[PDB]
Scaffold this active site. Sequence first.
Site, short mmCIF file in Angstrom:
data_model
loop_
_atom_site.label_atom_id
_atom_site.label_comp_id
_atom_site.label_asym_id
_atom_site.label_seq_id
_atom_site.Cartn_x
_atom_site.Cartn_y
_atom_site.Cartn_z
N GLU A 1 -9.82 -30.13 -19.33
CA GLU A 1 -10.78 -30.54 -20.80
C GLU A 1 -9.34 -30.37 -21.24
OE1 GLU A 1 -14.22 -29.43 -21.74
OE2 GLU A 1 -13.71 -29.98 -23.92
N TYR A 2 -9.06 -31.47 -22.26
CA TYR A 2 -7.75 -31.30 -23.23
C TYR A 2 -8.64 -31.02 -24.81
CZ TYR A 2 -4.79 -32.90 -27.13
OH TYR A 2 -4.72 -32.92 -28.24
N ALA A 3 -8.34 -29.99 -25.35
CA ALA A 3 -8.48 -28.94 -26.30
C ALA A 3 -7.76 -29.00 -27.65
CB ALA A 3 -8.90 -28.21 -26.61
N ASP B 1 -11.76 -11.05 -20.99
CA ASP B 1 -10.27 -11.23 -21.22
C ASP B 1 -10.72 -11.88 -22.94
OD1 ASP B 1 -7.19 -10.58 -21.32
OD2 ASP B 1 -7.23 -13.19 -19.80
N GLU C 1 -5.55 -15.74 -27.92
CA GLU C 1 -5.15 -16.46 -26.72
C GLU C 1 -5.33 -16.94 -26.43
OE1 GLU C 1 -0.28 -13.77 -26.49
OE2 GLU C 1 -1.70 -13.49 -27.11
#
Length: 266
Positions: free
Chosen positions: A88-90, A133, A137
């Site tokens: 999926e592209y955010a 984690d 980032e």
Amino acid sequence: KKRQWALEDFEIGRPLGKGKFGNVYLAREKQSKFILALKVLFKAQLEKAGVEHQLRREVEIQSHLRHPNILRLYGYFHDATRVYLILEYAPLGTVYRELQKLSKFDEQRTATYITELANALSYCHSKRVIHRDIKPENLLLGSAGELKIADFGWSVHAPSSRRDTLCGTLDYLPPEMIEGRMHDEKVDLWSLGVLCYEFLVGKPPFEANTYQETYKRISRVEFTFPDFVTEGARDLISRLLKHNPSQRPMLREVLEHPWITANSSK
Ligand SMILES: O=C(O)c1ccc(Nc2nccc(Nc3ccccc3OC(F)(F)F)n2)cc1
């Protein structure tokens, strides 16, 4: 998924970012014109460090998760020299870039992110996936500005006892992980408190100049608050940053926290 992709199925575009495994690209699937992101890992590089099995975990775990605040993994493929993750592209990029931009977030935007994070982690925990984690980032933003948990590189099944060679920043790891001990879902609750603090302050609360003293500050839980951090916020963060995992609240209590409810738009 049902069927097998190849590089030729995709037109590749602008480099989104990363990274030392290989980069992440905007791409478009030729036939559907579907826009997504393609993460290219290098094999040669994965094998000059034997991480091949961790990727299989990441892929296996992330591909089976459906939640609006978790980045979808649709599938993968490989050729001679590299492996490809279809993601999926955010569209609004990382939370880190946003934090760098604003320098710090207001209480409303923090509470909202914390809520979104909390929902996503609750879902994860229902499948006994623990993230381990969580950090700016690794968090992306959707087209509506909604937080999405993106990178599952270190996620794993709970409970867990791994002395995983901790190689990057300690800033988000709880005492039980840096000391190499056994740990469960409560790890992600500590990280949620680190994050909440960093969102409001602009820096993680155990930040230091060397690994060795960050280690010390974490295991002794030494943080202080700048004056501008409100009592409600201080209260939630203090509740989360507890050395003893069992004294950390449940996600439900995070969601039901008065400082969260008063400030969250979500
Ligand atoms: O700055 C931009 O222009 C930008 C715009 C859109 C996106 N959106 C995006 N969508 C899906 C995956 C992904 N990986 C990624 C990219 C860069 C750094 C770390 C990454 O991996 C992560 F998120 F897992 F850490 N980035 C990312 C960046």
